[PDB]
DNA sequence: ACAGTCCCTGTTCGGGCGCCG
DNA sequence: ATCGGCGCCCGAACAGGGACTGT
């Protein structure tokens, strides 16, 4: 493949900077003879030119084995040059997903050979890619070269080749507007609805078209028969699946190992329904030691069994039909954990996924359901460019009473109710009017800002009072602690009057779970009660029982 | 025609905003628009060596089927240099009409040294293709500098019409031309068509509205009547009997309102709650307290004195979800010194889409700020960041985009709607 | 009115996964 | 050891802003 005739992209250094001047570090003897042998080859191939003392820049060079290949990959530690290269706007905005592929009669996956080594580099920038090959004998000075093509490891190479490949495909795509070509780096998914004979004719026109542009499509990387290995998937004519996932088996695990296990489990959740990682990610909390060994908790081990259980059965995905409606259904598995499947025909999932983010310290299931619907909505726009219809495990009246009573603007797109327990519910509901015949509790709490000690108590209309001393607390916690006392020392119906907007805004939001132990205790009391009315009054205004309890806790 | 030199503010780089996902409906509309803009030399293809980007998306035009390409030039406008009188009578006119004259900007070329900053990227479904990047070669719609650079040309086009109709107020803000008059609605719409055709001798306007008899839900933001905008007073309940809980809600409400109205007092009302009573206990208002309440009702009815608009300070607008499709808003520059307090209700849908509601209220509040002060406010939105961002582009129809931030408000602002 | 502490929310970066050179 | 660009997840440091409090 002679160097492509595409125009070089003008590349500059950051303003007021010079090129890299890094000396070459030692290399092993297997790599020294290979880099010299390799460098004269890729000078002969034209990718590299010799340079003289006029070039004052340098970058260390080494040579590692190519990824899953017998060929050697020539790599340069361009960490110093990358810091000085101008910034780019990456045109790769995401990764194509098979669930967005439509059905096609004929499919071809190509791969360009020596991709970066086919695209020329801007002439003005070539001086800064200078490097030196140190000889074996330290007495020899070493041979300096500069780069004429896109180096592997340079920060601009991926973006420029992606931009260059689109320019190379633009004329061919225009000469044949009905052939779909999914372009990611050098790998080309070509799909058409023509007959199988005429389709192979167009592939050769493309290979010849790319060959004219210095882009070889080697036969070793040319796939013509299903199954297709594309973007880490195994593509079949009517079904798609992920290339085999290998979960490691070890008797003792470390932090790094856990980090790998979480990652592979996330990668599997796109098609395997029911993957859970909350308890496995909890083991990654606090420890930044990558080689630290972590004992699996009782809850963590249970989580691994569930995932392995659903991984023994093969799962497949379906392709997308633009004529048929898009459907997504969500189920509540664990606390703060959700799994979903997007399909068109029931039990024929296009893809799956999971949402398990705890947004906020205080939340409920209805909030998380709206958060999971949004993650799916955005994800559906990326894959299919449209919003799916929803099937949610929440009652129609449950949502109607929530969004009408919530102070923030919340909305859910077109959705239908599915009776897949456990359902999402509001566990308690605060009264809109004070309860008649209910003991009125005027609660408050205080704390010193230096001492961190505080009080929390209440006074009632029935004359009942209480004050509890607390150690290692804050103002916000003691005021929350006072509301907890009134719920403890009251019947099933209680009126509570507080002066804390912070405690009021948390409770009024009807949370069912919280990172704070105290809030979970307050939530639990509200579910046990039958009617609760919570009122707020401005503090330090001589109002009702608020004034009596304020003096009780401030002393 | 030579381009006007444009600089960024000292020490600031160009915009670098990622492109957000778009529906196939919007991408296919955008691809057609940008391909046509490149043919007419209005935009041109660029590569990844341009490190700047500005988000782009599409909106359906007002009472029309055509699509309008919208650039999120908020970041570029914040970093663009400042250039170099607002008609106070425009808000007094009976009828005011908003004309999209952004199409006129596409005739003036842009300074080459500046074009790198107008870059945007069109995404592709399922990431089939890399983003195709374009930059602008002419003055772009939605750019802070476009109306300024075109300012000399706009006064020239309008001067004959403004002397032929001296009773018509014409204000310009970004792509929009605000035309206000006191004529009757029918003679006013003819005058708008008179301005459109007299303008047509120089620059084009959006395809004439497929309707002309104000089809409901369609001319909300088109044909505006400023003389019917109403302020939302703060109200207090009127009951024959007040309870301890009712007096506490009253005292808390009045104490908050004393920050907006100076004379609010709650002392004789707080005296009624001096015990440690039950919430449902009825408290008779003493003769002293009845007067204090009656005086607070009077204070909230009279307008606030000594609150004037400062053109150097930014405008801020806050919206509260009051329920039943009703939304309250306040526009101010300093805390508790409101420049206007309004209410919007019965917006779009039979009160189903909350987000559609909030989006319309934000547009109507901004329109009022442009008409009243010629500025746009910064919004404090009562919505989750992701809930808005996901859907707001689906209901936006203005040529400008105001700045906003997201807040989680405690439910103690019942001080604006009864 | 100024300057702190608490709490919450969001942004950025670190790890992992995956793709490609 | 010893690289580039993208997307995603999850965890944690830092900052911002608004409320309470103490001076």
mmCIF file of C-alpha atoms in Angstrom, chain A residues 93-415:
data_model
loop_
_atom_site.group_PDB
_atom_site.id
_atom_site.type_symbol
_atom_site.label_atom_id
_atom_site.label_comp_id
_atom_site.label_asym_id
_atom_site.label_seq_id
_atom_site.Cartn_x
_atom_site.Cartn_y
_atom_site.Cartn_z
ATOM 1 C CA UNK A 93 -18.768 10.307 19.455
ATOM 2 C CA UNK A 94 -19.562 6.762 20.594
ATOM 3 C CA UNK A 95 -19.438 3.046 19.838
ATOM 4 C CA UNK A 96 -21.879 1.355 17.428
ATOM 5 C CA UNK A 97 -24.082 -1.285 19.019
ATOM 6 C CA UNK A 98 -25.373 -4.357 17.158
ATOM 7 C CA UNK A 99 -28.904 -3.780 18.441
ATOM 8 C CA UNK A 100 -29.009 -0.790 16.098
ATOM 9 C CA UNK A 101 -28.100 -2.816 13.006
ATOM 10 C CA UNK A 102 -30.888 -3.613 10.570
ATOM 11 C CA UNK A 103 -31.285 -6.884 8.713
ATOM 12 C CA UNK A 104 -29.380 -7.109 5.447
ATOM 13 C CA UNK A 105 -29.126 -9.729 2.743
ATOM 14 C CA UNK A 106 -25.337 -9.512 2.397
ATOM 15 C CA UNK A 107 -22.843 -8.377 5.046
ATOM 16 C CA UNK A 108 -19.096 -7.839 4.773
ATOM 17 C CA UNK A 109 -16.560 -6.845 7.417
ATOM 18 C CA UNK A 110 -13.259 -5.417 6.166
ATOM 19 C CA UNK A 111 -10.107 -4.285 7.928
ATOM 20 C CA UNK A 112 -7.500 -1.912 6.510
ATOM 21 C CA UNK A 113 -3.929 -3.182 6.759
ATOM 22 C CA UNK A 114 -1.308 -0.827 8.185
ATOM 23 C CA UNK A 115 -3.962 1.809 8.730
ATOM 24 C CA UNK A 116 -1.927 4.538 10.409
ATOM 25 C CA UNK A 117 1.051 3.692 8.180
ATOM 26 C CA UNK A 118 -1.043 4.493 5.066
ATOM 27 C CA UNK A 119 -2.059 8.064 5.986
ATOM 28 C CA UNK A 120 0.626 10.746 5.530
ATOM 29 C CA UNK A 121 1.479 13.196 8.290
ATOM 30 C CA UNK A 122 1.444 16.974 7.902
ATOM 31 C CA UNK A 123 4.766 18.004 6.423
ATOM 32 C CA UNK A 124 5.248 20.893 8.840
ATOM 33 C CA UNK A 125 4.750 18.572 11.822
ATOM 34 C CA UNK A 126 7.118 15.812 10.702
ATOM 35 C CA UNK A 127 10.142 17.474 12.291
ATOM 36 C CA UNK A 128 8.693 16.901 15.767
ATOM 37 C CA UNK A 129 8.373 13.111 15.326
ATOM 38 C CA UNK A 130 12.149 12.658 15.253
ATOM 39 C CA UNK A 131 13.577 9.684 17.097
ATOM 40 C CA UNK A 132 16.945 8.013 17.599
ATOM 41 C CA UNK A 133 17.844 4.326 17.458
ATOM 42 C CA UNK A 134 20.632 3.684 19.997
ATOM 43 C CA UNK A 135 23.065 1.092 18.801
ATOM 44 C CA UNK A 136 24.297 -1.879 20.804
ATOM 45 C CA UNK A 137 27.782 -0.453 21.167
ATOM 46 C CA UNK A 138 27.482 2.660 23.345
ATOM 47 C CA UNK A 139 30.310 4.152 21.292
ATOM 48 C CA UNK A 140 28.040 4.411 18.246
ATOM 49 C CA UNK A 141 25.889 7.576 18.290
ATOM 50 C CA UNK A 142 22.649 6.034 16.964
ATOM 51 C CA UNK A 143 20.528 6.604 13.851
ATOM 52 C CA UNK A 144 17.872 9.322 13.790
ATOM 53 C CA UNK A 145 14.610 9.084 11.823
ATOM 54 C CA UNK A 146 11.457 11.136 11.490
ATOM 55 C CA UNK A 147 7.899 10.034 10.790
ATOM 56 C CA UNK A 148 6.179 10.506 7.430
ATOM 57 C CA UNK A 149 2.941 8.732 8.459
ATOM 58 C CA UNK A 150 0.610 8.538 11.476
ATOM 59 C CA UNK A 151 2.570 7.036 14.391
ATOM 60 C CA UNK A 152 0.932 4.484 16.662
ATOM 61 C CA UNK A 153 0.700 6.008 20.116
ATOM 62 C CA UNK A 154 0.399 9.609 18.953
ATOM 63 C CA UNK A 155 -2.688 11.379 20.259
ATOM 64 C CA UNK A 156 -3.702 12.776 16.873
ATOM 65 C CA UNK A 157 -3.473 9.532 14.908
ATOM 66 C CA UNK A 158 -6.891 8.050 15.841
ATOM 67 C CA UNK A 159 -8.818 11.262 15.182
ATOM 68 C CA UNK A 160 -7.027 12.090 11.920
ATOM 69 C CA UNK A 161 -7.402 8.590 10.493
ATOM 70 C CA UNK A 162 -11.090 8.576 11.418
ATOM 71 C CA UNK A 163 -11.486 11.918 9.653
ATOM 72 C CA UNK A 164 -9.369 10.682 6.730
ATOM 73 C CA UNK A 165 -11.280 7.408 6.344
ATOM 74 C CA UNK A 166 -14.555 9.286 6.017
ATOM 75 C CA UNK A 167 -13.073 11.490 3.286
ATOM 76 C CA UNK A 168 -11.880 8.364 1.465
ATOM 77 C CA UNK A 169 -15.294 6.696 1.724
ATOM 78 C CA UNK A 170 -17.283 9.806 0.770
ATOM 79 C CA UNK A 171 -16.878 9.378 -3.029
ATOM 80 C CA UNK A 172 -17.633 5.639 -2.920
ATOM 81 C CA UNK A 173 -20.622 6.188 -0.656
ATOM 82 C CA UNK A 174 -21.903 8.809 -3.093
ATOM 83 C CA UNK A 175 -21.348 6.553 -6.125
ATOM 84 C CA UNK A 176 -23.570 3.979 -4.304
ATOM 85 C CA UNK A 177 -25.994 5.720 -1.897
ATOM 86 C CA UNK A 178 -27.976 2.614 -0.796
ATOM 87 C CA UNK A 179 -25.090 0.593 0.719
ATOM 88 C CA UNK A 180 -24.696 1.071 4.486
ATOM 89 C CA UNK A 181 -21.080 1.266 5.761
ATOM 90 C CA UNK A 182 -20.533 1.371 9.546
ATOM 91 C CA UNK A 183 -17.074 2.943 9.982
ATOM 92 C CA UNK A 184 -15.027 2.564 13.177
ATOM 93 C CA UNK A 185 -11.274 3.263 12.834
ATOM 94 C CA UNK A 186 -10.136 0.761 10.155
ATOM 95 C CA UNK A 187 -12.888 -1.843 10.578
ATOM 96 C CA UNK A 188 -15.706 -1.609 8.017
ATOM 97 C CA UNK A 189 -19.143 -3.215 8.370
ATOM 98 C CA UNK A 190 -20.564 -3.270 4.813
ATOM 99 C CA UNK A 191 -24.196 -4.331 4.386
ATOM 100 C CA UNK A 192 -26.546 -4.318 1.388
ATOM 101 C CA UNK A 193 -29.873 -5.736 0.208
ATOM 102 C CA UNK A 194 -28.566 -6.709 -3.258
ATOM 103 C CA UNK A 195 -28.208 -10.304 -4.356
ATOM 104 C CA UNK A 196 -25.166 -12.164 -3.052
ATOM 105 C CA UNK A 197 -23.471 -12.142 -6.458
ATOM 106 C CA UNK A 198 -23.715 -8.415 -7.177
ATOM 107 C CA UNK A 199 -22.783 -7.653 -3.558
ATOM 108 C CA UNK A 200 -19.322 -9.234 -3.821
ATOM 109 C CA UNK A 201 -18.856 -7.198 -7.009
ATOM 110 C CA UNK A 202 -19.328 -3.961 -5.053
ATOM 111 C CA UNK A 203 -16.969 -5.058 -2.271
ATOM 112 C CA UNK A 204 -14.191 -5.459 -4.832
ATOM 113 C CA UNK A 205 -14.989 -1.994 -6.205
ATOM 114 C CA UNK A 206 -14.603 -0.750 -2.635
ATOM 115 C CA UNK A 207 -11.391 -2.687 -2.132
ATOM 116 C CA UNK A 208 -10.168 -1.270 -5.425
ATOM 117 C CA UNK A 209 -11.528 2.151 -4.401
ATOM 118 C CA UNK A 210 -9.641 1.933 -1.083
ATOM 119 C CA UNK A 211 -6.606 0.543 -2.881
ATOM 120 C CA UNK A 212 -6.532 3.639 -5.087
ATOM 121 C CA UNK A 213 -6.352 5.649 -1.849
ATOM 122 C CA UNK A 214 -3.459 3.589 -0.478
ATOM 123 C CA UNK A 215 -5.781 1.497 1.718
ATOM 124 C CA UNK A 216 -5.224 -2.252 1.319
ATOM 125 C CA UNK A 217 -7.909 -4.697 2.427
ATOM 126 C CA UNK A 218 -5.894 -7.867 3.117
ATOM 127 C CA UNK A 219 -7.557 -11.229 2.606
ATOM 128 C CA UNK A 220 -6.421 -12.289 6.093
ATOM 129 C CA UNK A 221 -8.712 -9.553 7.491
ATOM 130 C CA UNK A 222 -11.517 -9.956 4.911
ATOM 131 C CA UNK A 223 -14.601 -11.736 6.281
ATOM 132 C CA UNK A 224 -17.138 -12.902 3.679
ATOM 133 C CA UNK A 225 -19.208 -15.546 5.504
ATOM 134 C CA UNK A 226 -21.383 -15.434 8.594
ATOM 135 C CA UNK A 227 -20.662 -15.565 11.489
ATOM 136 C CA UNK A 228 -19.016 -12.094 11.556
ATOM 137 C CA UNK A 229 -16.633 -10.965 14.321
ATOM 138 C CA UNK A 230 -17.409 -7.236 14.572
ATOM 139 C CA UNK A 231 -16.752 -4.771 17.409
ATOM 140 C CA UNK A 232 -16.171 -7.641 19.826
ATOM 141 C CA UNK A 233 -19.393 -9.396 18.887
ATOM 142 C CA UNK A 234 -20.246 -12.541 17.007
ATOM 143 C CA UNK A 235 -22.728 -11.444 14.359
ATOM 144 C CA UNK A 236 -25.075 -14.035 12.982
ATOM 145 C CA UNK A 237 -27.586 -13.476 10.143
ATOM 146 C CA UNK A 238 -30.626 -13.162 12.441
ATOM 147 C CA UNK A 239 -29.075 -13.094 15.918
ATOM 148 C CA UNK A 240 -26.128 -11.438 17.658
ATOM 149 C CA UNK A 241 -24.129 -12.283 20.763
ATOM 150 C CA UNK A 242 -21.060 -11.174 22.690
ATOM 151 C CA UNK A 243 -17.730 -12.887 22.232
ATOM 152 C CA UNK A 244 -17.074 -15.362 25.060
ATOM 153 C CA UNK A 245 -16.791 -13.707 28.473
ATOM 154 C CA UNK A 246 -14.225 -15.308 30.787
ATOM 155 C CA UNK A 247 -14.835 -14.667 34.480
ATOM 156 C CA UNK A 248 -11.683 -15.395 36.516
ATOM 157 C CA UNK A 249 -11.665 -18.125 39.164
ATOM 158 C CA UNK A 250 -9.478 -17.481 42.210
ATOM 159 C CA UNK A 251 -9.451 -18.590 45.837
ATOM 160 C CA UNK A 252 -8.306 -15.165 47.102
ATOM 161 C CA UNK A 253 -9.027 -11.876 45.330
ATOM 162 C CA UNK A 254 -7.400 -8.442 45.284
ATOM 163 C CA UNK A 255 -8.653 -4.909 44.710
ATOM 164 C CA UNK A 256 -7.406 -4.872 41.110
ATOM 165 C CA UNK A 257 -9.037 -8.263 40.520
ATOM 166 C CA UNK A 258 -12.334 -6.989 41.881
ATOM 167 C CA UNK A 259 -11.977 -3.979 39.568
ATOM 168 C CA UNK A 260 -11.718 -6.366 36.664
ATOM 169 C CA UNK A 261 -14.642 -8.474 37.808
ATOM 170 C CA UNK A 262 -16.943 -5.430 38.069
ATOM 171 C CA UNK A 263 -15.929 -4.305 34.586
ATOM 172 C CA UNK A 264 -16.563 -7.629 32.871
ATOM 173 C CA UNK A 265 -19.908 -7.935 34.685
ATOM 174 C CA UNK A 266 -20.943 -4.518 33.360
ATOM 175 C CA UNK A 267 -19.903 -5.531 29.843
ATOM 176 C CA UNK A 268 -22.098 -8.635 30.157
ATOM 177 C CA UNK A 269 -25.181 -6.735 31.350
ATOM 178 C CA UNK A 270 -25.896 -5.454 27.817
ATOM 179 C CA UNK A 271 -27.447 -8.805 26.856
ATOM 180 C CA UNK A 272 -27.497 -10.934 30.022
ATOM 181 C CA UNK A 273 -30.652 -9.996 31.993
ATOM 182 C CA UNK A 274 -30.331 -9.756 35.765
ATOM 183 C CA UNK A 275 -26.674 -8.860 36.369
ATOM 184 C CA UNK A 276 -26.160 -7.239 39.781
ATOM 185 C CA UNK A 277 -22.986 -5.474 40.915
ATOM 186 C CA UNK A 278 -23.998 -3.381 43.947
ATOM 187 C CA UNK A 279 -22.519 -5.735 46.553
ATOM 188 C CA UNK A 280 -19.462 -6.423 44.386
ATOM 189 C CA UNK A 281 -18.782 -2.706 43.954
ATOM 190 C CA UNK A 282 -19.162 -2.198 47.701
ATOM 191 C CA UNK A 283 -15.932 -4.166 48.129
ATOM 192 C CA UNK A 284 -14.116 -1.412 46.169
ATOM 193 C CA UNK A 285 -15.007 1.253 48.764
ATOM 194 C CA UNK A 286 -12.128 2.980 50.568
ATOM 195 C CA UNK A 287 -9.259 0.713 49.483
ATOM 196 C CA UNK A 288 -7.056 2.364 46.866
ATOM 197 C CA UNK A 289 -4.429 -0.394 47.121
ATOM 198 C CA UNK A 290 -4.774 -2.198 43.797
ATOM 199 C CA UNK A 291 -3.007 -5.341 45.041
ATOM 200 C CA UNK A 292 -4.894 -5.412 48.360
ATOM 201 C CA UNK A 293 -6.636 -8.721 49.073
ATOM 202 C CA UNK A 294 -10.350 -8.489 49.924
ATOM 203 C CA UNK A 295 -12.419 -11.251 51.592
ATOM 204 C CA UNK A 296 -15.719 -11.805 49.807
ATOM 205 C CA UNK A 297 -18.638 -10.837 52.045
ATOM 206 C CA UNK A 298 -21.661 -13.077 52.575
ATOM 207 C CA UNK A 299 -23.751 -10.745 50.376
ATOM 208 C CA UNK A 300 -20.994 -10.429 47.742
ATOM 209 C CA UNK A 301 -20.603 -14.193 47.261
ATOM 210 C CA UNK A 302 -24.388 -14.520 46.807
ATOM 211 C CA UNK A 303 -24.187 -11.889 44.042
ATOM 212 C CA UNK A 304 -21.527 -13.830 42.121
ATOM 213 C CA UNK A 305 -23.668 -16.990 42.199
ATOM 214 C CA UNK A 306 -26.641 -15.180 40.627
ATOM 215 C CA UNK A 307 -24.520 -13.801 37.774
ATOM 216 C CA UNK A 308 -22.787 -17.113 37.053
ATOM 217 C CA UNK A 309 -26.224 -18.749 37.176
ATOM 218 C CA UNK A 310 -27.541 -16.591 34.315
ATOM 219 C CA UNK A 311 -24.233 -16.857 32.398
ATOM 220 C CA UNK A 312 -24.408 -20.639 31.949
ATOM 221 C CA UNK A 313 -27.362 -20.146 29.569
ATOM 222 C CA UNK A 314 -26.618 -18.568 26.173
ATOM 223 C CA UNK A 315 -28.372 -15.301 25.394
ATOM 224 C CA UNK A 316 -28.813 -13.720 21.976
ATOM 225 C CA UNK A 317 -29.999 -10.340 20.772
ATOM 226 C CA UNK A 318 -32.201 -9.427 17.833
ATOM 227 C CA UNK A 319 -31.670 -6.788 15.197
ATOM 228 C CA UNK A 320 -33.697 -3.596 14.874
ATOM 229 C CA UNK A 321 -36.778 -3.150 12.697
ATOM 230 C CA UNK A 322 -37.442 0.547 11.971
ATOM 231 C CA UNK A 323 -41.074 -0.215 11.118
ATOM 232 C CA UNK A 324 -41.986 -1.744 14.488
ATOM 233 C CA UNK A 325 -42.335 -0.056 17.871
ATOM 234 C CA UNK A 326 -39.517 0.014 20.435
ATOM 235 C CA UNK A 327 -40.420 -1.419 23.851
ATOM 236 C CA UNK A 328 -38.455 -1.320 27.115
ATOM 237 C CA UNK A 329 -39.460 -3.010 30.379
ATOM 238 C CA UNK A 330 -37.857 -2.449 33.786
ATOM 239 C CA UNK A 331 -37.962 -4.543 36.964
ATOM 240 C CA UNK A 332 -36.798 -3.747 40.499
ATOM 241 C CA UNK A 333 -34.341 -6.471 41.567
ATOM 242 C CA UNK A 334 -32.483 -5.129 44.609
ATOM 243 C CA UNK A 335 -32.379 -1.960 46.680
ATOM 244 C CA UNK A 336 -31.161 0.769 44.353
ATOM 245 C CA UNK A 337 -30.684 -1.792 41.569
ATOM 246 C CA UNK A 338 -32.671 -2.150 38.351
ATOM 247 C CA UNK A 339 -32.467 -4.263 35.204
ATOM 248 C CA UNK A 340 -34.171 -3.622 31.877
ATOM 249 C CA UNK A 341 -34.683 -5.272 28.497
ATOM 250 C CA UNK A 342 -35.471 -3.485 25.223
ATOM 251 C CA UNK A 343 -37.385 -5.498 22.634
ATOM 252 C CA UNK A 344 -40.002 -5.254 19.881
ATOM 253 C CA UNK A 345 -41.524 -8.751 20.023
ATOM 254 C CA UNK A 346 -41.933 -10.160 23.546
ATOM 255 C CA UNK A 347 -39.107 -12.391 24.803
ATOM 256 C CA UNK A 348 -36.955 -11.362 21.803
ATOM 257 C CA UNK A 349 -34.708 -8.752 23.410
ATOM 258 C CA UNK A 350 -32.724 -6.387 21.200
ATOM 259 C CA UNK A 351 -30.432 -5.564 24.129
ATOM 260 C CA UNK A 352 -30.449 -5.465 27.918
ATOM 261 C CA UNK A 353 -28.877 -3.232 30.532
ATOM 262 C CA UNK A 354 -28.904 -2.120 34.131
ATOM 263 C CA UNK A 355 -29.181 1.036 36.224
ATOM 264 C CA UNK A 356 -27.849 0.978 39.780
ATOM 265 C CA UNK A 357 -26.918 4.569 40.640
ATOM 266 C CA UNK A 358 -27.777 6.060 44.019
ATOM 267 C CA UNK A 359 -28.584 9.690 43.199
ATOM 268 C CA UNK A 360 -28.514 11.729 46.384
ATOM 269 C CA UNK A 361 -28.290 10.760 49.964
ATOM 270 C CA UNK A 362 -31.987 10.517 50.322
ATOM 271 C CA UNK A 363 -34.202 8.968 47.670
ATOM 272 C CA UNK A 364 -37.151 6.658 47.021
ATOM 273 C CA UNK A 365 -37.950 4.007 44.423
ATOM 274 C CA UNK A 366 -40.049 6.400 42.318
ATOM 275 C CA UNK A 367 -37.086 8.764 41.904
ATOM 276 C CA UNK A 368 -34.776 5.935 40.848
ATOM 277 C CA UNK A 369 -37.390 4.655 38.407
ATOM 278 C CA UNK A 370 -37.458 8.068 36.746
ATOM 279 C CA UNK A 371 -33.653 8.079 36.780
ATOM 280 C CA UNK A 372 -33.543 4.654 35.115
ATOM 281 C CA UNK A 373 -36.120 5.703 32.516
ATOM 282 C CA UNK A 374 -33.880 8.639 31.585
ATOM 283 C CA UNK A 375 -30.780 6.484 31.187
ATOM 284 C CA UNK A 376 -32.714 4.183 28.863
ATOM 285 C CA UNK A 377 -34.246 7.138 26.988
ATOM 286 C CA UNK A 378 -30.838 8.636 26.184
ATOM 287 C CA UNK A 379 -29.420 5.201 25.373
ATOM 288 C CA UNK A 380 -32.320 4.543 22.996
ATOM 289 C CA UNK A 381 -31.658 7.825 21.169
ATOM 290 C CA UNK A 382 -28.024 6.817 20.656
ATOM 291 C CA UNK A 383 -28.746 3.325 19.353
ATOM 292 C CA UNK A 384 -32.004 3.820 17.430
ATOM 293 C CA UNK A 385 -32.534 7.587 17.303
ATOM 294 C CA UNK A 386 -35.987 7.431 18.891
ATOM 295 C CA UNK A 387 -37.590 7.131 22.313
ATOM 296 C CA UNK A 388 -39.005 3.716 23.264
ATOM 297 C CA UNK A 389 -42.391 2.951 24.750
ATOM 298 C CA UNK A 390 -42.090 1.910 28.383
ATOM 299 C CA UNK A 391 -43.415 -0.942 30.518
ATOM 300 C CA UNK A 392 -42.852 -0.062 34.159
ATOM 301 C CA UNK A 393 -43.556 -1.923 37.443
ATOM 302 C CA UNK A 394 -45.316 1.078 39.019
ATOM 303 C CA UNK A 395 -49.032 1.776 39.340
ATOM 304 C CA UNK A 396 -50.688 4.420 37.168
ATOM 305 C CA UNK A 397 -52.251 6.042 40.247
ATOM 306 C CA UNK A 398 -48.993 5.803 42.197
ATOM 307 C CA UNK A 399 -47.246 8.029 39.671
ATOM 308 C CA UNK A 400 -50.238 10.356 39.381
ATOM 309 C CA UNK A 401 -50.191 11.070 43.111
ATOM 310 C CA UNK A 402 -46.403 11.494 43.120
ATOM 311 C CA UNK A 403 -45.806 14.018 40.312
ATOM 312 C CA UNK A 404 -48.777 16.126 41.393
ATOM 313 C CA UNK A 405 -47.544 16.324 44.965
ATOM 314 C CA UNK A 406 -43.819 16.773 44.203
ATOM 315 C CA UNK A 407 -42.506 20.350 43.987
ATOM 316 C CA UNK A 408 -40.029 19.698 41.133
ATOM 317 C CA UNK A 409 -41.007 19.130 37.511
ATOM 318 C CA UNK A 410 -40.880 15.391 36.764
ATOM 319 C CA UNK A 411 -42.276 13.644 33.695
ATOM 320 C CA UNK A 412 -42.214 10.148 32.210
ATOM 321 C CA UNK A 413 -42.795 9.512 28.476
ATOM 322 C CA UNK A 414 -45.493 7.234 27.099
ATOM 323 C CA UNK A 415 -45.599 4.237 29.421
#
